[PDB]
Amino acid sequence: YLIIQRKPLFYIVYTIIPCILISILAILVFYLPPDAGEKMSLSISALLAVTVFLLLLADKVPETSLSVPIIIRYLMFIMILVAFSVILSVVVLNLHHRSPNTHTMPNWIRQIFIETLPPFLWIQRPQDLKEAVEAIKYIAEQLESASEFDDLKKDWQYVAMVADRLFLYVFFVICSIGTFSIFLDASHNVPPDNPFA
Amino acid sequence: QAGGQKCTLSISVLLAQTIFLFLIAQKVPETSLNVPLIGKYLIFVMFVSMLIVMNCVIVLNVSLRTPNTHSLSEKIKHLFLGFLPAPEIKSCVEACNFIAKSTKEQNDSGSENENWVLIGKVIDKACFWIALLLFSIGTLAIFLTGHFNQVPEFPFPGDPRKYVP
Amino acid sequence: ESGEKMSTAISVLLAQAVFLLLTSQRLPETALAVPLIGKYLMFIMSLVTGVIVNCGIVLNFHFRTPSTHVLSTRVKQIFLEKLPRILHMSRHDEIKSGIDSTNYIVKQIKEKNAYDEEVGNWNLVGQTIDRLSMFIITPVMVLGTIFIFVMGNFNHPPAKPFEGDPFDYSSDHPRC
Amino acid sequence: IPCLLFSFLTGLVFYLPTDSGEKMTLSISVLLSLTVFLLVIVELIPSTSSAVPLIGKYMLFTMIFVISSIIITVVVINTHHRSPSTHTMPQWVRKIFIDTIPNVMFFSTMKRPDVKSAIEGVKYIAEHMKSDEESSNAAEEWKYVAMVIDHILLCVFMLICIIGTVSVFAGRLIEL
Amino acid sequence: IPCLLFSFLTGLVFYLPTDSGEKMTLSISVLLSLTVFLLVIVELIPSTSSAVPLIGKYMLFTMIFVISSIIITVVVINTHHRSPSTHTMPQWVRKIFIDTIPNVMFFSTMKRPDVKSAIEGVKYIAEHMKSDEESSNAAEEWKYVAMVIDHILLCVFMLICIIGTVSVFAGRLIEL
Ligand SMILES: *[C@@H]1O[C@H](CO)[C@@H](O[C@@H]2O[C@H](CO)[C@@H](O[C@@H]3O[C@H](CO[C@H]4O[C@H](CO[C@H]5O[C@H](CO)[C@@H](O)[C@H](O)[C@@H]5O)[C@@H](O)[C@H](O)[C@@H]4O)[C@@H](O)[C@H](O)[C@H]3NC(C)=O)[C@H](O)[C@H]2NC(C)=O)[C@H](O)[C@H]1NC(C)=O
Ligand SMILES: *[C@@H]1O[C@H](CO)[C@@H](O[C@@H]2O[C@H](CO)[C@@H](O[C@@H]3O[C@H](CO)[C@@H](O)[C@H](O)[C@@H]3O)[C@H](O)[C@H]2NC(C)=O)[C@H](O)[C@H]1NC(C)=O
Ligand SMILES: *[C@@H]1O[C@H](CO)[C@@H](O[C@@H]2O[C@H](CO)[C@@H](O[C@@H]3O[C@H](CO)[C@@H](O)[C@H](O)[C@@H]3O)[C@H](O)[C@H]2NC(C)=O)[C@H](O)[C@H]1NC(C)=O
Ligand SMILES: CCCCCCCC
Fold it and tell me: Any stretches that span the bilayer, and where are they (chain B)?
């Protein structure tokens, strides 16, 4: 019998460190403002990169179906995490580009995302003359109407910011917990002290 | 315009074609007597995507032209838009008329950019009816040529026999 | 103002991932050492991930508004006054109705201009963060690359095998 | 599972607004991820031509799904950026997409000497302002149409993804 | 042939105006496609270190060409969004790129109580409009400079692609 322990430094580097960085990126995208338009780029490029790592790893994993190696479970975890980052970035961008002309803000969104959460997340925010006078009155009324429209736009954008920060914290927590629960499961796989033989 | 993502789509399709080229290169023999059909078609679609990247770049250049950079001529518009298809009161009045003049100037510049945009859309529709035809015809010719490459009827052309039991 | 910072950086990281892929299928899966090239790949991928994080911070600052953020005097002192100097950066009811209406228009226009002024200050803060990150990273990138690849280029073999043997084991100069 | 994720994400570009210049980014990057995964697949599964397996049927279904997603996305972007100067909204489109489907939904949050020069200028300004308001109303109607279409297609594509992963993997799975 | 396509596109990005946030997208995607093509080259090309082949010189050439295009693209983009508030156009910039070069560019086809507060507010509006028009003229000068540089580099890079696909493949092709 030959009880042999593997030295995974190669796999550590070539698959785990890149995935650590990708998972970092999948948390950052929630720190980005939707006004940039660089959010989908980040999220979906991270997904493409973890797909590249999957390709890398294809030619190096046993093709047996009695179990899934912790490495492929970790890669699928990061892949689904990036997927959910994409979904939630889409949601944030939807909320950010919402307006009264398209959406009516309900009361549960308002309550949750403007009253309850922001404290936790630390955000807290004579004919000619007659014509001329009527024209200037029209201008002023248009400007005040647009001010109200912008106020509602800003309420939607604040909802988006709050959801973004909540998702940031949630994703940091989830990624960290899963990564460390997978790495601890892997560090406690040590050959027995007696080989039973 | 910013957000349309023409070049994004085009160049990403080129990237996908490059990946497909890498995938095919893992499957074709390494002989240099004839070019196979799938590699020929990959080259064709890559050339087509290159030309369409060029066209998108040109349409973005034309649609985004301004009086500061380029002058729009009567002949260009006719070739595209017409053929192919007291001291206080004195201060008050001065300020008001200056405001109106500035507004008018801004809006006229806007109209000029709009004309450029429509020129671009016209070029775009024409270039589309050309690209659809080109790509479809290339694809179809190549692949029906493949479909028509069928084994002869006789094992030896001249020999009338089938050489079968 | 060009939505191309994160695109640039993350596409660079994708290229680096491709190079990592090409490298992974050139060496054996041994664990007695990290290959110099894999060392450099990890270093540079981490540095580019940091570049991406920094560009994200810069964008966050750039796109702040009085409606969502406050321009603390500390941040002004830091990223508009002090560091730029260090980094060496470049620089009759009807008539009454009409009167009240023009006054309201002026009020709103002044508010909008204050808004835009604070937005410009946030943008300058972003530019300062940007030059800082440049002057901190670009040297690091260049110097780490040079360090690694001279440490690699200066790995000539020992010029004499069998450490405790002055003999060169050469056909030219035998011993006896 | 990766092909499932790609399908699910293709059924999602329809919750991504068009004011966000990122729909093509998302869709075509899903397509790129699926192409790299096509590489993976060809490396893993067999190159048999005896028949079309389930992996192949599902991959081609997913690819056609992404292509249809991209095509309808382009249609939506073209409707959204449909200028009123050159396109007047039909009446059937307004009756269906603005007036019927919004209500047919319940789950959504959608809606349902000199002085004469001064007078001349202010009147010009107001006239131009109301013209701009009319153009904006038309453009917003187009945006609303595009958003309604997007919601519809979101539902449709999520449903297709579900019934597809079930159909392509039901006949045999129950037999097992 | 793919290297030819990539070099042509590299030279091509310089006809794309910065107004469209897609110069970096285009250049960097050309770079990504060329990196994937390096990936296939590594599989179809000998992995020997005795000499640089002709294809290897050509590949390195097109890669440096793409990368230089990206760098100069960044410089152009910055020259575009070069605000007057922080940078002032020097003398050589408006002497070469505005008074000399546009004149020797033939393939260009480019240009060569409360009543009192009311009047005070109108005057403030005029003040802000004047200052904004001045700053806007400055920004337009910067944009014109960027456009001229972009045209110059378009020409330079097309010519470099020509002489590069000819040089690398001329001496050998005449020995034949
Ligand atoms: C798949 O590939 C195979 C080849 O591997 C193809 O087979 C070829 O098919 C051709 C057409 O059926 C054949 O052409 C016919 O060849 C025969 C025989 O030719 C040989 O003998 C000739 C006569 O020799 C005498 O006379 C000479 C001149 O006076 C003297 O020098 C010699 O000593 C003798 O006294 C000779 O002249 C010739 O050079 C050959 O040695 C001819 O009789 C027919 O007229 C040819 N034409 C036809 C219509 O048959 C060809 O020979 C044959 N090659 C082989 C290797 O069998 C097959 O067709 C392919 N199937 C496909 C593509 O589907
Ligand atoms: C490595 O593999 C070998 C062979 O598969 C393992 O040896 C086998 O271990 C099992 C479980 O301990 C033995 O079965 C048990 O043996 C004891 C002996 O006292 C008996 O009392 C139990 O009732 C049961 O039969 C088996 O005999 C033994 N030998 C073989 C060849 O199977 C070995 O345990 C493995 N080592 C590790 C680290 O897993
Ligand atoms: C190439 O590899 C060979 C071995 O395959 C090396 O020769 C051996 O090197 C080892 C380690 O230096 C020597 O062991 C040492 O021996 C001395 C003297 O007893 C002792 O003081 C040290 O503590 C150590 O144990 C070994 O003697 C030597 N010889 C053989 C045949 O193994 C050789 O050095 C390598 N050359 C190079 C340039 O790497
Ligand atoms: C007194 C007229 C002010 C004009 C303001 C114009 C706002 C667009």
Answer: 7-25, 41-62, 126-149
